């Protein structure tokens, strides 16, 4: 049948960027224009593909990665970018083929005192590889003194909370991100646009 896109975009729960979610879209027909027509998206950036030609294309593997970041970090989701989110939370490949979609979610993911249940990693010994996910809770050793497993001098817990308050600036307001990854191999297709599909 049709691809489960509303399940990804309209999901009742979004993950923290450090524990970003992934869904495979497979054995389905993908109506992309219903998402590209929508005027609800602050960002719709496609790399290596065209938002229109997608409906006349077929792909071997398609992944939808979802998470929540703040506005000023949406620029980091693009390929070849640097920063805490790109280096330590969600890295895109330089050969990335797919679209990055974002929308302001202040009405859902913000509370007056602050919604602190959305986390990010600001400390890591190495940079993430493309599409790696790090959900470790180990204390980070920012200096030469070992940490002995507890937070202290130059020994930090590597996760902090976005404080999402409705009065914040848009650059500090929560943004929900969905990343469509498109992969074409010499192998059977699992997702095809409608222009290459048969519907009874």
């Amino acid at each position: 049948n049709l691809c489960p896109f509303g399940e990804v975009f309209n999901a009742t729960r979004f993950a923290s960027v450090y524990a970003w979610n992934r869904k495979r879209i497979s054995n389905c027909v993908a109506d992309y224009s219903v998402l590209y027509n929508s005027a609800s998206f602050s960002t719709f950036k496609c790399y290596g593909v065209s938002p229109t030609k997608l409906n006349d294309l077929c792909f071997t593997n398609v992944y939808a990665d979802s998470f929540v970041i703040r506005g000023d970090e949406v620029r980091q989701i693009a390929p070849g970018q640097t920063g805490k989110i790109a280096d330590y939370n969600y890295k895109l490949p330089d050969d990335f083929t797919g679209c990055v979609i974002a929308w302001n979610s202040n009405n859902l993911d913000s509370k007056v005192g602050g919604n602190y249940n959305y986390l990010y990693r600001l400390f890591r010994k190495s940079n993430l590889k493309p599409f790696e996910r790090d959900i470790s809770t180990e204390i980070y050793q920012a200096g030469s003194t070992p940490c002995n497993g507890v937070e202290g001098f130059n020994c930090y817990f590597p996760l902090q909370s976005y404080g999402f308050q409705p009065t914040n600036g848009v650059g500090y307001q929560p943004y929900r991100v969905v990343v469509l990854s498109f992969e074409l191999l010499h192998a059977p297709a699992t997702v095809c646009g409608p222009k290459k599909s048969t519907g009874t």
């Epitope: 979610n21 249940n117 986390l119």
Partner: single-chain antibody, 237 residues
Framework: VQLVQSGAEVKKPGSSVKVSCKAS????????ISWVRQAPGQGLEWMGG????????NYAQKFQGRVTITADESTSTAYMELSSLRSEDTAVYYC?????????????????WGRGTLVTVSSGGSQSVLTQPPSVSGAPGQRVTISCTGN?????????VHWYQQFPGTAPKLLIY???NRPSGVPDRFSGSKSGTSASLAITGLQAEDEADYYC???????????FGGGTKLTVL
């Protein structure tokens, strides 16, 4: 650490129960304390958890607005309160530590468990997202396998699969973390694998002492939570 839980409680329908989980060390140091339920006809269900050092919470959609999880580093005790109790809520409620790591398909597992607190509510069915055969039989000294078949949302997405071993009268115990890795104390005869939407647990040199229930755990992004399998009773002839 060792996780010690509260005593058994008998409650009436519509009442509320609040159970406690206290750590031996007395620090709750950078740990994530999760609550996993085992209710007849509903299998193993992750309910939620908290990272005490941050105080941030995470609940399962099925129990949200009905469960409340708190932690207090002073007492080194975490609490879980279930409201509007129903007869189906009768279950062995476990407290467990939630571990993490860094790979492309990394997802949490539960390495340390408590004995479990029993809650009986006095006076339908939940189908698992991961499918296992109810029963598998094997002869001693031969190789046996158990299958776990997730949908596109979990194993198809690439999420790793972990395995838990549960003996009669005991609590679930980690057997395989990651797709193939073994905690210390697990024999080399146990092995794991993942391909496509399915995962496998292989036991070689099968012995009578391997006769137990085996579960597979993955992360389902359609539910945004950890999911367990229906369980497989291995029988050694």
């Amino acid at each position: 650490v060792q996780l010690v839980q509260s005593g058994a409680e008998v409650k009436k329908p519509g009442s509320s129960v609040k159970v406690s989980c206290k750590a031996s060390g007395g620090t709750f140091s950078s740990y994530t304390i999760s609550w996993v339920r085992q209710a007849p006809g509903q299998g193993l269900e992750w309910m939620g958890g908290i990272i005490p050092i941050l105080g941030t919470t995470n609940y399962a959609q099925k129990f949200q607005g009905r469960v409340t999880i708190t932690a207090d580093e002073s007492t080194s005790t975490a609490y879980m309160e279930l409201s509007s109790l129903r007869s189906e809520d009768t279950a062995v409620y476990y407290c467990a530590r939630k571990f993490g790591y860094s790979g492309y398909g990394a997802t949490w597992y539960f390495d340390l468990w408590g004995r479990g607190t029993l809650v009986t509510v006095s006076s339908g069915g939940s189908q698992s997202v991961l499918t296992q055969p109810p029963s598998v039989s094997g002869a001693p000294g031969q190789r046996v396998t158990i299958s776990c078949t997730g949908n596109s949302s979990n194993i198809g997405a690439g999420y790793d699969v972990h395995w838990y071993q549960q003996f009669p009268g005991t609590a679930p115990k980690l057997l395989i973390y990651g797709n193939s890795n073994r905690p210390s104390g697990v024999p080399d005869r146990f092995s794991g694998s993942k391909s496509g939407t399915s995962a496998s647990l292989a036991i070689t040199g099968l012995q009578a002492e391997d006769e137990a229930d085996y579960y597979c755990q993955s992360y389902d992004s359609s539910l945004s939570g950890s999911v367990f399998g229906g369980g497989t009773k291995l029988t050694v002839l």
